Amino acid sequence: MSQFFYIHPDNPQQRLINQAVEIVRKGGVIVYPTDSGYALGCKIEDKNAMERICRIRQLPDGHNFTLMCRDLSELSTYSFVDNVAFRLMKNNTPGNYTFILKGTKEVPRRLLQEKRKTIGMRVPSNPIAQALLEALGEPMLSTSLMLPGSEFTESDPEEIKDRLEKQVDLIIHGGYLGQKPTTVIDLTDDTPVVVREGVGDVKPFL
Fold first, then answer.
1. Domains in the chain: how many in total?
2. Cα separation of 56 and 39, whole Å?
3. Alpha helices in the chain (DSSP H)
C-alpha cells in the first residue's frame, strides 16, 4: 500500500521531503502537489516507473511526458531553448504552464515524443514541489494527475488515496488544490501554439 505523507504546503518539513526523494531515488512512483493540481512523478532514469505512470495517466497518442524542473536554468539544460522561447518563458515562470520543447541529450530517448522528439517542460511554483526538486537535484519525470478523458486534474488528496493507494508508492498530501491544469504552450518552430488552456494566461503567447 502507498505511503501517505502530510506535508505542510507553505513550509514543508524537510524530513518528509527527504524521505519522499529517497523513495523516488529507489525507483518509486509518487503523487505530489503542484501549483496546478496533483501530479505523478518518478526519476528520469527508471523505465519501469515511467511505464507505471504512463498507465495511470493513460498517456494518449503523441502526448508528451513532462519534466518537472527547478527553474528556467534547469529547464534550459534539458531542452533546446532559442531566443523566442527564452524571452517568453523568462516572463512566464514559475508555475501555471507546461512548455513543449525539443529535449536535449540529457533526456533519455524513451521520454521524447517518438516523431517530434519533444517533451513538456514545467517549473512548479509551490513550496512542496520546489522542495522535492531541490532535494532530488535534477528534474522529475512527471505528468499531471487527471482522470481518464477528464479536462480536470485530481485535487483532493483523500480521493487520490482512495483511487491510487494500490498503484503508487507515495502520496504527498499537500492540501486541496485547484482542478484546472497548466496551460500548455508548444514553443517549437518559434510559433507558440496553445495546446491546452489552463491556469496560465494564453495572451502572452497569442
1. 1
2. 11
3. 14-25, 47-57, 72-78, 83-90, 127-136, 157-164
As given in the structure block, the three cell numbers for residue 47 are: 523505465
Q: Which residues sit directly before a break in the chain (C to N > 2.5 Å)?
A: none
Q: How many residues does the chain have?
A: 206
Is the separation of the CB atoms in 106 and 18 below 8 Å? no
189 burial type by CB count under 10 A (0-12 exposed, 13-18 middle, 19+ buried): exposed
Looking up residue 127, the CATH number of its domain turns out to be 3.90.870.10
Contact 30, 24 (CB under 8 A): yes
Could you tell me the residue range of the domain that residue 76 belongs to?
Answer: 2-206
